[PDB]
């Protein structure tokens, strides 16, 4: 928000306004990075981004400590080298390359379509990067009629998403990605769980309106009483939440689930790609921005 608005005070004392991305701006498959870029906490054009830029942006404007993004930074730069063909040093070329499929970007996302979702031909691909309202609605419908959801609910959501993706993706494309997705499940609990409840650290409950605002608008739900977590969330919270999601009991099992879908997931680790492997072509779509309604500087 505008620095003088005081909307972030006293959790964020140095805010910048929301600015919608233009047609030439680079955006990510990540709702967090997109929100940061929309506010210029990382470059608004989504290009040439250093580790420290990202660390400071997450810590000072989102209440997310350095520990939370340590692996994410490692993987971002691995994907950058893979996509571009050369070492990206400490300048991430752009955000768009992060939508390289079967890498950091993965299938059965909460709010994005899959790279080969519903395509009639093997070589075809679609926008697996921009926010997709229809996809996100499939996630929200699992918790329809609710204001909050827990670990068990999140587990049901990711299962529903896995089921839908396995059915809709071109035969052979679907690849389960529990370790990455459920770090991201942990991310959701870290950012938009209801810290106003007395037991937030034992059984954090996500506020659905906060989640919906963040994802749909790619800006921060301050108007709904949200603020950056204080103290900043640490990696321990995230991986514990991740483990708790996958450990939660399933009361409704979707069909067409991949093998081993229900149960614990592997620890997320650094990505690696063969030097001979050519990257998949990136979707070229203009960056998404909210239009119903469009957002003002303080939204
Ligand atoms: C530099 C650090 C980060 C990088 C490089 C990064 C990168 C990515 C990428 C490539 C995806 C796409 C995966 C997919 O859904 O197919 C993604 C998704 C996601 N990111 Fe990040 N991320 C970072 C930090 C964060 C943080 C700190 C949060 C929140 C605390 C966050 C929230 C999310 C969520 C919730 C998704 C899932 C979106 C969905 O499934 O629709 N990210 N991120
Ligand atoms: C973000 O950065 C990535 C990585 O540099 C960009 O993707 C790449 O964009 C270039 C065009 O600037 C593509 O190069 C072209 O390749 C085709 C086919 O090989 C060739 O006919 C052209 O002569 C040109 O060399 C490249 O394919 C593409 N990489 C991938 C894997 O898709 C991306 O455009 C950037 N996005 C934004 C919004 O800045
Ligand atoms: C995206 O952001 C917009 C702008 O903040 C939200 O629309 C506002 O919703 C709040 C509810 O707290 C109201 O006070 C305002 O009257 C709304 N403004 C306008 C112009 O509609 C919108 O709800 C957000 N989207 C989601 C899905 O959360
Ligand atoms: C991205 O651009 C490519 C051409 O540069 C196309 O081959 C792709 O289909 C894709 O096009 C989509 O996004 C662009 C924005 O760059 C739009 O102009 C197209 O209408 C399409 O949605
Ligand atoms: C914001 O400023 C107030 C008043 O000086 C201060 O008490 C608070 O600690 C500041 N917040 C942060 C996160 O620095
Ligand atoms: C989130 O983190 C937990 C603990 O590392 C994993 O078990 C899960 O697969 C996901 O990566
Ligand atoms: C989440 O998981 C990690 C290991 O993946 C632990 O280090 C952390 O304490 C938390 O249990
Ligand atoms: C790890 O941390 C999470 C979040 O604080 C808890 O919900 C979980 O029970 C475990 O202690
Ligand atoms: C990962 O961590 C969670 C929360 O502590 C457990 O529920 C799970 O069994 C696994 O150890
Ligand atoms: C986890 O617990 C539920 C009860 O809520 C059962 O339905 C399920 O079989 C599993 O034991
Ligand atoms: C068991 O409970 C879950 C909530 O965790 C529901 O999603 C499901 O429909 C069933 O009632
Ligand atoms: C749906 O069915 C699976 C087994 O296929 C269970 O693990 C789950 O608890 C739910 O009842
Ligand atoms: C229970 O919930 C699962 C996942 O949301 C559905 O796939 C199933 O149809 C039932 O409603
Ligand atoms: C990481 O691991 C892969 C193997 O999957 C190698 O191809 C790469 O060179 C790096 O060592
Ligand atoms: C987004 O842009 C529209 C104009 O199309 C405005 O009505 C709105 O206030 C927001 O700035
Ligand atoms: Mn995805």
The string of DSSP codes covering 156-225 is HHHHHHHHHHHHHBPTTT----HHHHHHHHHHHHHHHB-TTSTTTTTS--EEHHHHHHHHHHSS--GGGT
52 ligand 7 Cβ < 6 A: no
184 labelled catalytic: yes
Closest by CA position to 43, among listed 96, 98, 95, 97 = 95
Q: Give backbone dihedrals phi and psi of 214, rounded to 5 degrees, phi first.
A: -55, -50
Phi, psi of 9 (to 5 degrees): -65, 140
Which residue's CA is the nearest one to ligand 10's atom 1? 249
Way the structure was solved: X-ray
Q: Quick check: helix, strand or coil at residue 233?
A: strand
3-state secondary structure of 230: coil
Q: Who contacts 211 (Cβ-Cβ below 8 Å, separation ≥6)?
A: 188, 192
To the question of whether residue 105 is assigned a binding role by annotation, the answer is: yes
Closest residue CA from atom 4 of ligand 6: 239
Beta-carbon count within 10 A of 237 CB? 22
CB of 166 shorter than 6 A to ligand 13 = no
Is the domain defined by 2-299 classed in CATH 1.10.489.10? yes
269 lines ligand 9 (CB under 6 A): no
Is 210 within 8 Å of 203 (Cβ atoms)?
Answer: no
| Closest residue by CA, ligand 15 atom 1 | 294
β 47-49/206-207 pair status: unpaired
Rounded to whole angstroms, the Cα distance separating 241 from 165 reads 23
DSSP 95-159: SGGGG-TTTTS-SS-SSS--TTBT-SSTT-----SS--HHHHHHHHGGGTT-SEE-HHHHHHHHH
- In the structure, ligand 16 is a single-atom ion and the residues with CB under 5 Å from it are 105-106, 109, 112
Query: What residues contact residue 151 under an 8 Å CB cut-off, 6+ apart?
Result: 189, 203, 241, 244, 245, 247, 248
109 labelled ligand-binding: yes
Q: How far are the Cα atoms of 89, 109, 114, 264 from residue 165, in angstroms, in the given order?
A: 35, 9, 7, 20
Which of the following is catalytic: 184, 202, 236, 267?
184
Q: How far apart (Å, rounded) are the C-alpha atoms in residues 191 and 214? A: 10
Three-class DSSP labels, 247-281: HCCCCCCCCCCCCCCCCCCCCCCCCCCCCCCCCCC
Q: Are 176 and 187 in contact (CB under 8 A)?
A: no
CB 49 within 8 A of CB 92: yes
CA dist., res. 225 & res. 32, Å (int): 18
106 is in an annotated binding site: yes
Q: Could you identify the atom of ligand 3 that is nearest to the CA of residue 290?
A: 1
218 marked as part of a ligand binding site:
no
């Amino acid at each position: 928000q505008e620095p003088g608005s005081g909307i972030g005070y006293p959790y964020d004392n140095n805010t910048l306004p929301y600015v919608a991305p233009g047609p030439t701006d680079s955006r990510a498959p990540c709702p967090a990075l997109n929100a940061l870029a929309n506010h210029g906490y990382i470059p608004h054009d989504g290009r040439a981004i250093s580790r420290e830029t990202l660390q400071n942006a997450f810590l000072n404007h989102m209440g997310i400590a350095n520990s939370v993004i340590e692996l994410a930074l490692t993987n971002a730069f691995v994907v950058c080298e893979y996509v571009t063909g050369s070492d990206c040093g400490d300048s991430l070329v752009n955000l768009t390359l992060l939508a390289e499929p079967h890498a950091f970007e993965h299938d059965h996302s909460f709010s994005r379509k899959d790279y080969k979702q519903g395509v009639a031909n093997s070589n075809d691909f679609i926008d697996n990067r921009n926010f997709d309202a229809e996809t996100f609605q499939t996630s929200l419908d699992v918790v329809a009629g609710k204001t909050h959801f827990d670990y068990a609910d999140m587990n049901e959501i990711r299962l529903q998403r896995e089921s839908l993706s396995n059915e809709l993706d071109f035969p052979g494309w679907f690849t389960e990605s529990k370790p990455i997705q459920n770090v991201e499940s942990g991310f959701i609990f870290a950012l938009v769980s209801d810290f106003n409840l007395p037991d937030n650290d034992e059984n954090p409950l996500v506020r659905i309106d906060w989640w919906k605002y963040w994802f749909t608008n790619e800006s921060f739900p301050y108007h709904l009483g949200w603020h950056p977590p204080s103290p900043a969330r640490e990696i321990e919270f995230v991986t514990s939440a991740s483990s708790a999601v996958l450990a939660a009991s399933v009361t409704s099992t979707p069909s067409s689930l991949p093998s081993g879908a229900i149960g614990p997931g592997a620890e997320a680790v650094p990505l690696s790609f063969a030097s001979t492997m050519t990257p998949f072509l990136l979707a070229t779509n203009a960056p998404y921005y909210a239009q119903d309604p469009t957002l003002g500087p303080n939204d």
